[PDB]
């Protein structure tokens, strides 16, 4: 979500998912802003075990 509230740490490596980027941030574009939350640890997931 373009809101960044708190996870603007989150946006940083939803920019490090390049392969990726356009994909995540459109869709938290029309989205529920709670869905960035989601998407946080979706990446999390995708792009390593895990970002805990």
Same mark, same amino acid.
């Given at each position: 979500?373009?809101? +960044?509230? %708190?996870?603007? /740490?989150? +946006? =940083?490596?939803?920019?490090?998912?390049?392969? !990726?980027? +356009?994909? @995540? %941030? @459109?869709? %938290?574009?029309? @989205?529920? !802003?709670? !869905? /960035?939350?989601?998407?946080?640890?979706?990446?999390? %997931?995708? /792009?390593? =075990?895990? /970002?805990?």
């Amino acid at each position: 979500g373009s809101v +960044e509230k %708190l996870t603007a /740490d989150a +946006e =940083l490596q939803r920019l490090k998912n390049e392969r !990726h980027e +356009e994909a @995540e %941030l @459109e869709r %938290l574009k029309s @989205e529920r !802003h709670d !869905h /960035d939350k989601k998407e946080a640890e979706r990446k999390a %997931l995708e /792009d390593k =075990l895990a /970002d805990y």
